[model samples]
Target: LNQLSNSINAAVAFLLEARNLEGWWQDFNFPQAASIGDEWVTAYVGTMLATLPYAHVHEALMQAWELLKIRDHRPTGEWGYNYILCGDADTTGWALQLAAAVGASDSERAQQARAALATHLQPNGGIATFAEESIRAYIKVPDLANVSFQGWCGAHTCVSAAVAALPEFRSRLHDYLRVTQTSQGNWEGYWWSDHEYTTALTAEALAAGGQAADQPSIEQAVAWGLKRLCPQGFVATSKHPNGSTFATAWCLRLLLLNTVDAEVKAARAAAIGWLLEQQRPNGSWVSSAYLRIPYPFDRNPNQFPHWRYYDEIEGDKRFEGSIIFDHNSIFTTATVVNSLVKAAPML
Candidate 1:
């Protein structure tokens, strides 16, 4: 309880301190790269702030929403992960949900935002990430030459799950979530790699939109996560044996969904404790979570467009760009904050 309280205060201070002058938080994976992206991450971080149970968080949440309000496409609403031309359903969907959570769902602006997101809805009840081609560039290849290769732009499961939970967009994709669960019970992410991030997102969405009907799916996901718990206090996947700080936070979040269960209650506290240990001197935690960038129109040998290997692209930047697990930290830190803050009162 002591650690949980201090962790929240310290991390909350870190978050408020890290905010840009305009109020939103930016996701950064590399120092050398001149990257493009803010709106999506801002909405994500904005939502992160909005949903906390604490009273002090409200001021910051509203301050962050001010940025989201401005960046969104007004009237015929849209929000780009990069800018207006590449406006994506992933960002738009979450933006509206964040607005809805913050009491903007009935506002004239949010109503229009809802209308625009409706256009990006896929036929199978999934939300597509990209309405326009998201272009990418390679390090060795000249920038001008790399732009020709377009990346993935279609219905994304994680996006669909997030949108389905919206008060304004509830239940549209419960069937989609029901059908997409992997044999192991987790859903795959289109804009992300591996399972935990999307799986966690899907589980929470399902729990919110259809908890009673979705309990079976939730149970299976919980079983899969329990099978992966490491003795040292983290969640391990086949890909990451040392364990993922990013996934640990998400997994804690997953466990919190069913905190009433004895085993889950114990595990979340354990994971929460481990997460607190991962903090750097800066009062922020590092993110090993991979955020995919759909890039390199022509795929790398055996590689899909999103996250390229280090050798295939540049050196560290490519790795940072893809699996950055880098120090920029805001993306995962917000997630960590969400995990810690939510479970504080519970444990």
Candidate 2:
């Protein structure tokens, strides 16, 4: 317990010191553009801080909340990374999660955002990235209709997880998600091909929606993920060079929360050990850039590439290109801390 406490304290201390003088970290990993008051990054950090056992960072957490609040361009009741008026599922989901974690779930602002998200849910249970009206009247691009947000890759899952925090919304979409899984036992990502991201997030969403770990669909999904575990005690999608800390952390959270047994137990410990080993001297984890901009459709050989047949050549090149952009320590660190915090209770 002391060792875990020390690690958390060290990580929290490192993040606190790493913020810009004005109380936020400049997240540059977004595809559209980079911005300082990144609502996504701020909300993630606030949620992690809110989950901590220590209260010393309450003031800092409030500051982060304030940053997110200021970014909430009301009326529309959504948040965006580079622009205020642009509210998407991924950003709005993170913002809502942060608000809930900080005990602001009942705030008028949070409610407005939640209501806004409710309008975007598809009949099939997936949440579209853009609202119906927005796609119809604003973008004028028909092909993007009901396009899955993949905002952060699993934007729907994130929204579902957040809504699951409320009794009324729990288990509302589990049936759709269960039916949507591939026979191979993976939920595909919308923007990227990383099965790990979506599978792990879907597992979380299902668990949050009240599904038991032993549920047939959930059990199958977990089996698939366990099969993909890298020999190095981490997790990554196929074709990536090495297992990423980001993927490993998310997978760890799933294992910690749901699965139990000697083998699963050993997997959890090995994952935690790998994560601790990946932490830099500065107390941050190094992760491959999962956020990326896909090739323009005009240039794509297939006018509309679905995950079923999308080629990895261009995707790999884009992934490498994404790596050239600045790595996001704040986003990566917050995710790791959140995972570790969740694991603490079980470990």
Candidate 3:
């Protein structure tokens, strides 16, 4: 796992290196693996880029603030998460996060991103993915029953990323609590699937709350994550066959942010250990499915579910899938590595 972790970390390190336009990552384009040149890239890449500064990507951080200056939406009062584009809840969450990264909270855009939360909020309290029905909606076709659209874009990780990255988004955090949280005190998977998506999203929310000194919220989420731990690691959900390296790493990341309770602390270390093992020599990790853009491009166009590597789990069979070296996946890889880097100073 250590080797795998290192490989993933290095591969993502390279990708981050590639996406950087001065300081920020480029948006994905057609025919390319993850092309850039769109509006929402800020929401997707902004927060992820903030996390890269502690590693070799420090040079890229050089231009992040400058680009943010030109891209900021504060002057227009049309606040959204995307840059070079119109309003989007997910992108709004992301924009505020990047703004906070460079201490630009006092800027007009920062204030607007927070204020926009008032009237523009989706049913679930988070910003809508996009005002454009086709673009904002997460599912292929609009369905009110969809969890992602219940606030349509009330994705756990999306909310977590925004809230956790920006302190101003902290007070608004309660909105997510009220809307997206399940009656069981968990979150639903976005869009059509209501599977438990708590592991990673749980981490994002708690990390944000902890950063803001909201102790009680952090404690509840941390406790919930701790309870999810199994002898091998956390089961992806109460429903899945078992724990996945991705899911386990996601929750473990949240728990690791604050308090360091002995049990969760050790569990996080072990989970990181497991994630490290999953890295490949080429610096990619495997997933049951390939990563894709939202809505129209939900599934990777080229990838067939028949890829042999995805079918063979450590023990399980009959699961056909594809692996992705997606921007988000690469960001996830860097996150795990950053945790290791932070942990190393203490060790």
Indicate which candidate wins on TM-score.
1
Query: 179-268 in candidate 3: lDDT tens per residue?
Result: 554444445343212122333454455555545544555566566666666656553542235655445545665566554467776766
lDDT of 1 by residue, 82-126 (tens): 443455677777677677667777877777777878887778777
User: Per-residue CA lDDT of candidate 2, range 201-239, in tens?
Assistant: 766666665545426777777777667676567886543
Residue 111 lDDT in candidate 3 = 74
Best by lDDT: 1
Candidate 1: global Cα-lDDT? 0.69
Off by over 4 Å in 1: 29-36, 54-56, 72-75, 133-151, 237-240, 294-327
For model 2, the superposed segments whose C-alpha errors exceed 4 Å read: 1-3, 30-37, 132-168, 211-214, 236-240, 295-326
Candidates by lDDT, descending order: 1, 2, 3
Worst 10 residues of 3 by lDDT: 190-199
* Candidate models: Cα lDDT each: 0.69, 0.62, 0.47
